[model samples]
Target chain A: AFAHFVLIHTICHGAWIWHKLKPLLEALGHKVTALDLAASGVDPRQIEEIGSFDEYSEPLLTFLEALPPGEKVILVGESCGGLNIAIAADKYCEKIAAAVFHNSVLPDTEHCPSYVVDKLMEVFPDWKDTTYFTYTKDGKEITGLKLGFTLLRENLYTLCGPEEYELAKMLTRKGSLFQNILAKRPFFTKEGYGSIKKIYVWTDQDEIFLPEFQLWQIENYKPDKVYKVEGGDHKLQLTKTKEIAEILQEVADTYN
Target chain B: AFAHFVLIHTICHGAWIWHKLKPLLEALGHKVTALDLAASGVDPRQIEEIGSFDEYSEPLLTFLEALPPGEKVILVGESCGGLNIAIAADKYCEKIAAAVFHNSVLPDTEHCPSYVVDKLMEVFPDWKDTTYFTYTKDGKEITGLKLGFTLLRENLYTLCGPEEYELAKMLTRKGSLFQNILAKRPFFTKEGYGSIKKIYVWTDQDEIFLPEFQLWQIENYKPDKVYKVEGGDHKLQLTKTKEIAEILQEVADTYN
Candidate 1:
């Protein structure tokens, strides 16, 4: 049976990040939907206008909401996108067969929604020229960051090709973690998000989300399985497209 | 000496269209800037808020305005991007060494700014599932279109690879011609846009802008030089990146 995979991109990135992996998955006889969150990618909203993490995750939520009854999708999230997957899984857990975290944050039901992001900020302090700014949303100041070119080249796309690196630089936009809002949000429910099967896929060479941080996430919230690739950077979808595709195929066969 | 090349994308496309070409140009020791026009690409503006063609061409104009004194660039426009190049040249003629039209609209000083667009609509009548909608801007209704996947794969990406085609599908956004607004705008001035050296490049294999229409454009407004690629699609930058880069290098050596 062909599995439906919904891919979610990290902060400041859009569905464009899944450009390489989507085709590879499709060629393997699977259905794929790559979405741009509100204010990200080509989605016409701006970060300032997005008042909450739920609002930012509107596209993914709306997508899951519209899926046909009895149709379950495998949600794949990269980096901060894992938070989005958790949010969606909480709301529509029955519609999700499993969640795959690809070098992504793994949120646990034991902590507040902002736990992973807070831990990430503590572990990785130096973003290297990344600009942070404050924007008012609903009369409250919200912090957003735009990834600089140097950070993109040195940290995010360390192992990707020049064209992929250049594409990232050209398309990246300002994004936010909505940390303040997430801090107040309730933890994931065991009956909802926690009930869904979880799988963690990561690379050892990721600079932005260091190996220790990734291991901390896996240890903090145990997933059903773990797959680690060597030598790939933060963007394994671009750096190791085929290898990741193979893993995803195995995941679909196992879960779906 | 290194030459600066400003790459512009057509309607519904962004600077991401130049992803392959930008790195290739930089590798050859040329300076390249690929910009997303207002409301296009990852540019955070919405098309409905943009009232006129001049507003849509803001990024290009801003880039040209910020160029240091005595620094000139070679403007490369693909498809409807030729209109953008024309608009920028009108305001910053002295700042442009030359304008290259790559399978693009060739606007003449003798006609209104909407001349080429109008002719395009007349020549290419069948847009196959491409949706056109009306949106109000400044109390007047403006037309915008979203290209269909069939049109993209069959027409635009005919000669492109699957990854390039998939990338186009993932990144394309809704865009407007602003034809009515352009019709009311003044024609390009002889001393401004008309004075700059123009080079038209085209391919016979283009489906949307057919061979006849391209030749008609060339004949309507004679360019200083014309380069005909033997076999490439509408997106020559993706289909024939190295070939186009070589042509741009020659243009820089000759003009700059």
Candidate 2:
């Protein structure tokens, strides 16, 4: 009998990503709701329509704000969604019991670690013959972004079986890149977001944000609790869905 | 069938710590051997007898050496044993398939991490009031040492049952101190020791090494794979014996 969990997906992924996980958590007598950020997943909003981080994360914010006055929920974020959950927790600190970063970004507002920057650089730029930038620039600003199939296979879904991998490719869509690049990180206060407990779920076989980078975030953020799952890619929820659900219950049992 | 496993214990503990874990791993069809370092546990050697790192870890080194040629084992170390496992991997890289550091000290050869240095400074003194120094000075040089009980319950067995805690107090004994402070860190070369796969098991609720320090080691040492266990204290092999056994099997199934 734990609080409800609000799950958010990565850059190009949607609530559909947690379809397998939702039922598992629910069957264990916990409520789980997965949401699609504005301009992400199957959301109809075009990337150009998204300007600020708030605008990009309106759905999640709206959901939190709409929750009954004193109700608090566990916030779970995956990949880029980790950033979204942090911002949501900052805005609605009273509404969040804890925030879980699942193989997701755990960042410091001041400076990024060298390892994270290095990994980003390794995969971001285009080769000599082609232009493979993620964002489409409108003069000086990014207007839209593309989700390459190759990027999905190489980083996020490498461990996924052929069928699950195909579902991932079919479901991913364009997302707001500027929402991350131009957004100023939300400042969490001691009496507000900082008071809430945080958890980091380390995915062992992640190729994108390598295990070292995942650990850098854990060391920096100092999450109240930590969980580790071996042999999952970035989107562990797809393969290790039951394990993730059990871990959430375990956290609730220990900390709640 | 999985590879053989050599289980090592923490600084103040012994092979007895793995009493529950060894049987669980063995039940899963894997061969397991728990070793007591020189001057620790039931091993009759006195701390004064261990003059160097080689002398301190001769039992483990000898065991690996005596293994039939070409036979390999998975070397698992917990707490202070992490240091011993690294040294063993350095000396017998060809005989080790992987080295797993479970809530243990993973030291780099250079300057010690500030956190480790700070913790050591907090506990490693008291000549007049308590006589609690780890290294015993026999006039001109170091001799025997004792493992403090207060340090034991506060970190290793905080989550243990009353009976288990009492057992910890009863089984504890005097052990080597210079084995940790005086030994030069074993250097791992890319072709030899570094060639063996390394894994880290991060115990979330560990108060001794703590989760942040564990992640710091994972970041610096760059283990090939990592697993996280939530709400387990430093000595998880006791309470989390089944989970530890399953995780080892998972690692073996994935890599071996």
Candidate 3:
């Protein structure tokens, strides 16, 4: 029997992204679960409620920490969710059978860096000028990053067709740049985080993490095994669900 | 309108592998052609007749060389087909709008390395030992590599269900590993092969070339655009035809 898998979504997405994949794995007789981080996705927590990575990721931390003794699970993370997953693996290595990163950020072993929202345009040569990202240095002591539909449609949802794109557009929520700016960076240890097996599912056509960018990380971290999903945007859980589930199954069969 | 596409199959398999994909692309009003290399698939040439890479890939070379001057087409290759497509791109850069590789070998630049038939076990750790490979150093002066049904089912045809697997088993023929071992290496020039746009469609669940092996090749041969089909074995064009067609359409819209 395959081990249980706990799926995590990237920035601006939710457990809703894995709706298509959850049932497929379950139908194949595997256990699956997905969670939304405190301030990202559809979670109701206000951005202010998340003052650090610890606060933003408490829900996942608590979930993993509370797992029954000797019960190990496959912890799968996408994009930004990768940061916390390593933290989970770090804190509860015994509770994780393997950590899977699918078109995601590399785990933070040292201090994680943050970039100004304005700098994104300079970073991606193809960044859309029409992308609407609102910033507030207003009289009030508050700031957040709210994404425009067109930006998401162009960069994150291009692989999915019309109907799938529509659902993604409808469900996306505002994101706080604070998570990147103010969050506490997590650290990894050889005995803790390093003990859990790490696997990566390369998203071949990720606009956010281009193939070269992903390859550099793969070369650096040297994960146990790697998988590929030829071309989906950043949000492959929504675009290539069946393939993702099957890859997860392969990961389970091979690693777990 | 998109340019015409010429699809080539891997060794052992014939143009017939694209049977499910040709009509889908054509139905959408694009031109498509699938070719059987000499002595492969349904081609009547005896395996002994094709002794070198030049002879084996002559049909593809001749077809591309004969294209009307100033007319460009999209070239797609799978598995060993990747070897020749680069030669095609190298020699006829002006006639190719873009070259696509999916679950295939990246064109080895400089010198193409050869692998002994007996050393195959160490290459793919996940390769099923049950696969039957018959080597005839028997009463003949010439040698050949013939595969049994279990090998194809385990590697190329895993994603395909019972019906597809059955058909694939019925159609496969004897392939010359000699082509891989003795094939003349093709080199690429910056002006010729480098000028044409290159795209890669990675198949995540390829048992033939395990994901990490494919990722290593992708890392070596940097492509302009990358796409991912999260889970399909080497022969995805047959199992995931609709999705493959959509990805090809996306490639055309973005790059072609």
Clashes in model 1: which pairs? none
For residues A1-256, could you state the per-residue lDDT of candidate 3 as single tens digits?
6779998876656665665667678777888777877755435455555555555677788888778998889998887677667667768888888888977776535434332122333445564533434343322233445555676678777776553454444445555544344333434667887778888887778876777778867776788888888766777776787788888888888765
- In the order shown, the candidates' DockQ scores are 0.80, 0.01, 0.01
For residue A178, model 2's alpha carbon misses the true position, in angstroms, by: 2.4
lDDT of 1 at B56: 93
Rank the models by lDDT, top first.
1, 2, 3
Residues B1-256, model 3: lDDT tens digits: 6658899887766776676777788777788867778776545465666655556777788898888888778888987777667667767888888888877776545445333222233556443433434343323234455555677778778777554554454455666645444443444566777777888887778877777777777777688888888766778787778888887887777664
Model 2, residue pairs in steric clash = none
- Model 3 chain A scores worst on lDDT over the 10 consecutive residues at A112-121
- Model 1: per-residue lDDT, tens digit, A77-139? 999988898889889999999999999999999999999999998899899989999999886
| lDDT of candidate 2 over A1-256, digit per residue (tens) | 5769998887667776776677678678887777768866545465666665557889999999899987878989887676676667668988888888888776444453223334444544441222223444333355354566776777767877554555454456566545344444344445655677888897768877776677776776688888899777877887787789889998767655
Which candidate leads in DockQ? Answer: 1
In order, what lDDT does every prediction score? 0.91, 0.68, 0.68
Error of 1 at A36 (Å): 0.8
True-vs-predicted CA distance for residue B46, candidate 3, Å: 1.4
Q: How close to the true structure is residue B120 of candidate 1, measured as C-alpha lDDT? A: 88
| Candidate 2 TM-score over all chains jointly | 0.46
Go through the candidates in order and give the C-alpha RMSD of each one to the true structure: 1.7, 24.0, 21.5
